[PDB]
Design a protein around this ligand. Structure first.
Ligand SMILES: [Ca+2]
Ligand SMILES: [Ca+2]
Ligand SMILES: [Ca+2]
Ligand SMILES: [Ca+2]
Ligand SMILES: [Ca+2]
Ligand SMILES: [Ca+2]
Ligand SMILES: [Ca+2]
Ligand SMILES: [Ca+2]
Lengths: 205, 205, 205, 205, 205
């Protein structure tokens, strides 16, 4: 089994429009933002222009294949796989994906998609130029799937919150924390899980 | 009918170019804007840059299926369904859809599409920085279908007009009301229904 | 015959790349701009940012269908029909079509396409802030078809020149007139008809 | 052989990805810019924002057909024909094609494509506000095909250099000249022909 | 076989989604940036707006043919070939490809793709207006493929670092050097090679 045979199968059998749900069991999607840069801040308008890696992970067993005597991983175009319909609730602009829209698929059906995104948000900027700085919270979760179909969860809290952050940034990061939530909206019957990421940063002293 | 079978049928049988009309009966489309944010205001030019959820709903019985022994709802791509050719009459820019273009389809043929849109409009801004504030009216309705084919109607007046509004917005909402209309234009023979939404807001005093 | 059957036929038999010409007879296309708004003016640079309805009409008999028992009209996507390759000669930016790109087709082969366009032009702005105001002329005609294939003609001079104009516009319209032309260019052998629309407006006083 | 039949053949037999080369003989492509307007100039940054007609012409005999009793020319979409991969070497932005992307095809296989393009360039602006003015040179030629496959050549020097120029332009044209070249680059083995157009203009006085 | 037969084969047999890997052997991709221009600099924000040729080269033997009596090179659209999923790690905007997205393929399976790109970056701008100037480093490597699949390497150090640079640029180039790297990220298990290009330039005097 070669990469050609592997990609060819996934391409020929995959269905991007169908969520890899197993029974009433929701699809476990883990989200993790890794800030790469903070470009524009406006404390007057409370708007931020930031860059980050939307490190996403989930499992699709219909993509699994035996790799004992074959490659364990392959790069698959996002368009040939089903992908979480995630959305940043307080995004003020659409995502400007800066990187190739390819995902990584492991023979066991594990999918890893980590695109670099530049996007504007509406959040609390007050305190940016302070020692305690500002705390901009960004909430992102499925747009059409509720908790019974899709569930989002945070990840790796170890990793230095700014090991990927640009050093030439006009700003600096104090701390980053992610706490998942589960909300029921008057608009909508069922509950919608989402990961809230709090970006505590400040202008470089 | 697993989710794959459901989506597969809709995809294979649907016709996005055909309005789900039953007899001389128009398609009942309900529109409801939920303001999420007001980004830029210019009282001199009377131009607004706002974000909102264009909560739309209508019914397409050709999408209905028996859900007695399967899911009741599925997420369908907008491109696989017929969608109302709505247009904001005083929109100054085209809609910047910020969210995944997926709709939600209920087994009974009910369709719910609620994209988050950022868009500019030409309306009355005078009074923005006033206690009574300004009242910006936005009218949206079908562009090519008259009242006999498509009819638009407002919805849920209860819901707090700003329960989804951003708190970090430079502005605040006093009140929001929607009143449907029915106009005949010299340009055009038949009548064209539309929902007029009045946004009474003001700068934070 | 119901809309599905109608749209289905047009879709299956139409050819967007073929001009509906009958013999050496040109296709009679009528153009009519209805100004909706004037957004930015610069008398120094003679540039205008305006919004208007490019009300276009022509006839394609290959789309005609018997309707003694069926609607005589349907909404057809622009991509499934042949459309006039019109261009605004003094357009400084490309057309930002603000509305659904659907056309209206009458059972007799009559086609009506009226998109709302925002676009910048290079024209005479001098006099904008004057009682007599400025006169910005915009010329639009087929880009590749000469008078023997396509002929453009103005229309309805009655209709109040500003019955669709925005009232919140920083400017106001004095008068609008359209006079068709027929030019032969040294560059090009045959003659190219075009409609010249003169927009006499001024800053509201 | 009406037009539908003509377009239908070209569409069904054409191959946009294949250069109409005859033997080791290159394809003779003639390029000719006709300036329509000069919109923004910055002598400090040496950047120009200009509009022009990229009048292009070449020959593709596989498109030829018997015009004995059938139309001689037809309008063909650019996407159904092979087109020169021209590029403006000092273009600072990509081409904003302002007109329908249709080409004109003559029964003998002659192809004429003249789109109106707005684009920014990096060139010599110094002297713009002078009697002798500035001379902005723009070089454009095939990006991937060398002299043995594609050869570019200038054209009609008669035509008044500003018979299509906008009169409301903040600037004026003194003279326009085009001189073809043939360069071999260290980067690249073979030689690459290109047409250099010198735009001598100045701010009006 | 003619140009047509060659392109036709590549088109009919190629697979853009499959990396041309031979055994556990990685694909050797060589990257080389040739700066064409530096458009905007901001020492305060450490952001650069630059234009360059992302001269890329690699080998895909499945594209090789017998040119022993046929043309040896052809221009192939990027969409019909597999292409390295390269990404500029500190790119602040996505690539604005200014040129035709065509690659050059040699009968031996060698592929050469050199698009002209305008793009913004986050790097060290301090010193721009200095004799020693600033050194802006840009790192680019595969986004999804590690060193075992894709390996990147610099190239030709001879070529005058500014023989393609614009002379009208507000800035000038002192020196350009490229040194490949190999990094293992806590985020990611395997190692990811990348080419680091250091642009030492300064404002003119
Ligand atoms: Ca194989
Ligand atoms: Ca942390
Ligand atoms: Ca099943
Ligand atoms: Ca209310
Ligand atoms: Ca009139
Ligand atoms: Ca000349
Ligand atoms: Ca052949
Ligand atoms: Ca060097």
């Amino acid at each position: 089994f070669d990469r050609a045979d592997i990609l060819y199968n996934i391409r020929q059998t995959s269905r991007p429009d169908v969520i890899p749900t197993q029974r009433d069991r929701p699809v476990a999607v883990s989200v993790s933002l890794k800030f790469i840069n903070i470009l524009e801040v406006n404390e007057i308008t409370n708007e931020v222009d930031v860059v980050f890696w939307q490190q996403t992970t989930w499992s699709d067993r219909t993509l699994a294949w035996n790799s004992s005597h074959s490659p364990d991983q392959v790069s698959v175009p996002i368009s040939s796989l089903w992908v979480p319909d995630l959305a940043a609730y307080n995004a003020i602009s659409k995502p400007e994906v800066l990187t190739p829209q390819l995902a990584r698929v492991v023979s066991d059906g594990e999918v890893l998609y980590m695109p670099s995104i530049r996007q504007r948000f509406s959040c609390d900027v007050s305190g940016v130029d302070t020692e305690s700085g500002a705390t901009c919270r960004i909430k992102i979760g499925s747009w059409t799937h509720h908790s019974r179909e899709i569930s989002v969860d945070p990840t790796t809290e170890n990793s230095d919150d700014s090991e990927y952050f640009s050093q030439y940034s006009r700003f600096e990061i104090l701390d980053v924390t992610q706490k998942k939530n589960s909300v029921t909206y008057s608009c909508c019957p069922e509950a919608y899980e989402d990961v809230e990421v709090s970006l505590n940063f400040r202008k470089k002293g």
